């Protein structure tokens, strides 16, 4: 895992603006639906074959 | 005769055309008017175009031949708009008409003959 | 998939039938003394124009003088003489290639091996000799065909 990072070495995280998260949330939600859609179509092809 | 009205039908072929127009109106297959004839050319749903050579300015209908040469659509002229008026079942003179594509229509055999006759006029 | 076929039904095959004749079909027609054009008309009740390829015509010529009568019947002005530019003489491959391309011909043959290949191509009839009469296999508008 190697989770630990020392206090001196660690860097502050990125702080996203509200507009960026709205765009970023749109893609992941879109990708989840699209990935789900393809996987369902995979089983229909295999059953018919 | 004005030379721009080149496909001018004779007496015998005129009788066949105006009969076919009267048949087409009954079967709901005819579009009447210069503007309505133009619209069918854009949609590609015309077999042929019948125009009246007795319009006092002949130029108002000369845009229809330009569209016909691109769609490869036969077209002819007749000597009377008033004779063209009655055969269309309309109470006014008409200078241009268009007969429409109809799938399964029983007019296909008669239409197929009249197209071949028009092409013979162009030799 | 060709537009002429409605599933296994060939619509654009028309009352003028173009028939590709195999080299063996000519020989058995003479043996049974069946006229080539006249017997086809009796089977289909329609105008028929047999087609002779260059590949088929060569196989007749290689047979020798013993089959001279079949060669003279092959050159008939009513027939349709269609060329082919194929490196060789073998004709079974020539006909199936013409069948695959256009789907407008009726195959006339008596060889069993060629018939089983054509059956795999959808929408093409096969004409063969049964008893002393012509017979058609995969055609809906057979009409005057031998009834058995």
């Amino acid at each position: 895992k190697a989770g630990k990072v020392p206090k001196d070495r660690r860097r502050p995280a990125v702080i996203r603006e509200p507009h960026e998260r709205k765009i970023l949330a749109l893609l992941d939600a879109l990708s989840t639906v699209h990935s789900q859609k393809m996987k369902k179509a995979k089983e229909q092809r295999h059953l018919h074959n | 005769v004005n030379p721009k009205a080149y496909p001018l039908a004779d007496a015998h072929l005129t009788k066949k055309l105006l009969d076919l127009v009267q048949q087409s109106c009954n079967y709901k297959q005819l579009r009447k008017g210069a503007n309505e004839a133009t619209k069918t050319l854009n949609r590609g749903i015309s077999e042929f175009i019948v125009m009246a050579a007795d319009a006092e300015p002949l130029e108002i209908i000369l845009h229809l031949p330009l569209l016909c040469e691109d769609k490869n659509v036969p077209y002819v002229f007749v000597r009377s708009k008033q004779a063209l008026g009655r055969a269309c079942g309309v109470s006014r003179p008409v200078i241009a008409c268009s007969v429409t594509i109809k799938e399964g229509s029983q007019l296909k055999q008669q239409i197929q003959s009249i197209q071949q006759s028009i092409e013979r006029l162009l030799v | 998939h060709p537009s002429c076929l409605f599933f296994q039904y060939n619509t654009q095959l028309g009352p003028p039938y173009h028939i590709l004749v195999d080299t063996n079909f000519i020989n058995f027609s003479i043996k049974a003394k069946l006229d080539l054009v006249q017997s086809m008309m009796d089977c289909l009740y329609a105008k028929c124009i047999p087609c002779i390829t260059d590949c088929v015509m060569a196989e007749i010529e290689k047979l020798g003088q013993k089959y001279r009568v079949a060669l003279r019947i092959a050159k008939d002005p009513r027939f349709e003489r269609l060329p082919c530019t194929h490196k060789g003489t073998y004709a079974d491959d020539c006909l199936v290639q013409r069948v695959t391309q256009h789907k407008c011909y009726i195959v006339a043959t008596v060889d069993r091996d060629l018939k089983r290949r054509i059956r795999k191509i959808p929408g093409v009839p096969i004409m063969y000799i049964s008893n002393h009469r012509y017979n058609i296999e995969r055609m809906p508008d057979d009409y005057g065909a031998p009834r058995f």
Binding site: - | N35, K39, P57, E59, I60, L62, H63 | -
Partner: protein
């Protein structure tokens, strides 16, 4: 097999001689290299004569004769000179071959090996005649292709609508371009005499008066009298001197004043060109589309052509779409632009626009397909709308 071939080209006529060829097997894979490969072609064919065309008009004359199949005098001069007088001459056209044999005693053949030789000559033509003519072979064909095509169709160069398309776009740019400069001029001279922007309501008018008075310090007596002539009314000019005497603007430097003077002058010279462009557009519209210009005006008529992209495209459109071309700028809705006698009520504003669109479509067709353009039809259509406008306004 020694025979002569006559090859006709846009640049001129060529005469070539054939020494030897394998005639029977010419159309075969191995032998076809005889004509294809340049070196082998040079072995069997030579150029014995070449008579190029002097001018483009001469080239057009020969092109007409060759198409008709007659023997032009230019062709006959070449043939008579370098051909000995038992002669076989190859031609690509059977009709020109018969005409030559009637005019002169040479035997003409039109097919066989000669057909393959002519393709070899055509494929290798630029190499044989390279440098013999000033104008290139490739440009010779391109130039002749147009002049031959214009002759057949009776093309008229006056009735072309390229210039009106450019002029409308250029008018749009100039109106913005003058406007940007005019505002900057008013700001710079505002530092010296801010009252002037209030008196003058026109950007262009401000520019000449900026030229006319260098400083407010010297504006009096005769120069005041000159000022009343340029200003539309005498009352304002007397107030200008009063404004000049009592003003809070700042004195400007020497080099600063020379800069603003030359700049303000340039806006004027730009403005006078814009007026000349509008004059040039008006003359073009009468020659191109007089009937449409009479109906709705040169300014609106030219802009309608610009939206369509060409005069022919305007005629091909139906009556319904021509209304849409003026939708964004309200060309048919906004009536005083086009000015017509009488006014249209708000209730019938849509109907007048729809009726006006049909008249413009008809007028556009007359301009495009008339043998000679004439503006009588446009004036007749203008009267009919006015009768309709009076019909709605008065009720009869």
């Amino acid at each position: 097999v020694l025979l002569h071939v006559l090859f006709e080209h846009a640049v001129g006529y060529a005469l070539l001689a054939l020494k030897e060829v394998e005639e029977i097997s010419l159309l075969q894979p191995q032998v076809e290299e005889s004509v294809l490969n340049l070196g082998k072609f040079h072995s069997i064919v030579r150029l014995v004569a070449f008579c190029p065309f002097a001018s483009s008009q001469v080239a057009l004359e020969n092109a007409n004769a060759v198409s008709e199949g007659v023997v032009h005098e230019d062709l006959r001069l070449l043939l008579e000179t370098h051909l000995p007088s038992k002669v076989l001459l190859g031609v690509g056209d059977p009709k020109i071959g018969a005409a030559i044999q009637e005019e002169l005693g040479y035997n003409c053949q039109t097919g066989g090996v000669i057909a393959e030789i002519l393709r070899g000559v055509r494929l290798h033509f630029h190499n044989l005649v390279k440098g013999l003519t000033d104008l290139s072979a490739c440009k010779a064909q391109l130039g002749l292709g147009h002049s031959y095509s214009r002759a057949k169709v009776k093309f008229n160069v006056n009735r072309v609508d390229n210039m009106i398309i450019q002029s409308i776009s250029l008018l749009d740019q100039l109106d913005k371009d003058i406007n940007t400069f005019s505002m900057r001029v008013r700001e710079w001279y505002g530092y010296h005499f801010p009252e002037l922007v209030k008196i003058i309501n026109d950007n262009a008018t401000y520019c000449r008066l900026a030229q006319f008075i260098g400083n407010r310090r010297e504006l009096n007596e005769d120069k005041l009298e000159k000022l009343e002539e340029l200003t539309m009314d005498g009352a304002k000019a007397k107030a200008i001197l009063d404004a000049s005497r009592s003003s809070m603007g700042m004195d400007i430097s020497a080099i600063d004043l020379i800069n603003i003077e030359s700049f303000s002058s340039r806006v004027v010279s730009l403005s006078e060109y814009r007026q000349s462009l509008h004059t040039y557009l008006r003359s073009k519209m009468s020659q191109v589309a007089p009937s449409l210009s009479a109906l709705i005006g040169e300014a609106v008529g030219a802009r309608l052509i610009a939206h369509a992209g060409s005069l022919t495209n305007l005629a091909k459109y139906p009556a319904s779409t021509v209304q849409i071309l003026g939708a964004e700028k309200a060309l048919f809705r906004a009536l005083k632009h086009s000015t017509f006698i009488g006014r249209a009520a708000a209730k019938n504003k849509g109907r007048i626009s729809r009726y006006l669109a049909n008249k413009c479509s008809i007028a556009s067709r007359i301009d495009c397909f008339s043998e000679v353009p004439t503006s009588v039809f446009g004036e007749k259509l203008r009267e009919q709308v006015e009768e309709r406008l009076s019909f709605y306004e008065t009720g009869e």
